[PDB]
Amino acid sequence: GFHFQQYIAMAGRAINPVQWTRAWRRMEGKSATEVYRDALAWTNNQFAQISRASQYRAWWWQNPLGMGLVLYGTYKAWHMIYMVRKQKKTAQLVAAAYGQGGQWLNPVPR
Amino acid sequence: GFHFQQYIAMAGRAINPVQWTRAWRRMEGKSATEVYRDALAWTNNQFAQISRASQYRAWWWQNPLGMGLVLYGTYKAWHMIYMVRKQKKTAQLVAAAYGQGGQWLNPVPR
C-alpha cells in the first residue's frame, strides 16, 4: 500500500465541480476503451510499484505483519464508514416501520 | 518519546509476583536515597536520549508536529483509560445516590 494521501487528494479533486468541467473538456475526442485502458494501466502501475518497491524499501508503517495490517485497516475503515452507516439507517427504518427487532420476528402463529 | 514497548514490558515485569521476590532480594543492603537516585538517573537518561537523538534521528512516528503529537496521544490515552473510567464510576454512584444530574441540582427553595 502507498499514497493514501494522494488518493484522498485525488478524491478531493474529483469532487470539485471545476474538475468536472475540466474532465468534460478533456473528454473531447476520446473513447470509453481509451478511458478504461488508462484506468487499468494506472491501477496496474500502482500494484507494480508495490510489487517492485516492497523488495527493497520499507514504509513508515512497516510492521511484523507488513502490508496485511494496512489492508486490514483500509477494509475496517471502509466498513465503519459505509456499511455501519447503512446499518444505522436500516435500523432506524426498521424501527419506524415495525419496531426494534421487527425483521427477526417469528411468523404469526397459526 | 521512545521505547513505549519497553515501558509496557517494564510494567508487565513489575506486576509479576516473581519479580516482587526478585526485588525483595535485590533490596538487601539498599537505601531509599539510592533507589530514588537510580530512578531519577533512569528518567534523566530517557530525556537525555530524547534531547540528543532528536537532533539527528527521526522515528517511524515522525510527523510535522514532531513529539508534540506523541505527547498529546500519551495524554489522551491516560485520560481515556483513567479519568473517563472514574467519570463512569462517579456517574453510577451519583445516579444511585441522588439521580442523574444530582450534583447540579438547585438548592431547595425556601
Binding site: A58, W60 | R57, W59
Partner: peptide, 22 residues
Amino acid sequence: YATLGSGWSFSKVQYTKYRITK
C-alpha cells in the same frame, strides 16, 4: 517493474524503527 541489475546476489533487507534522514 522489472528487476534490473547484473547481480546474482540474492539480497533481502531487515527494517529498523528509524526513518531515513537527509
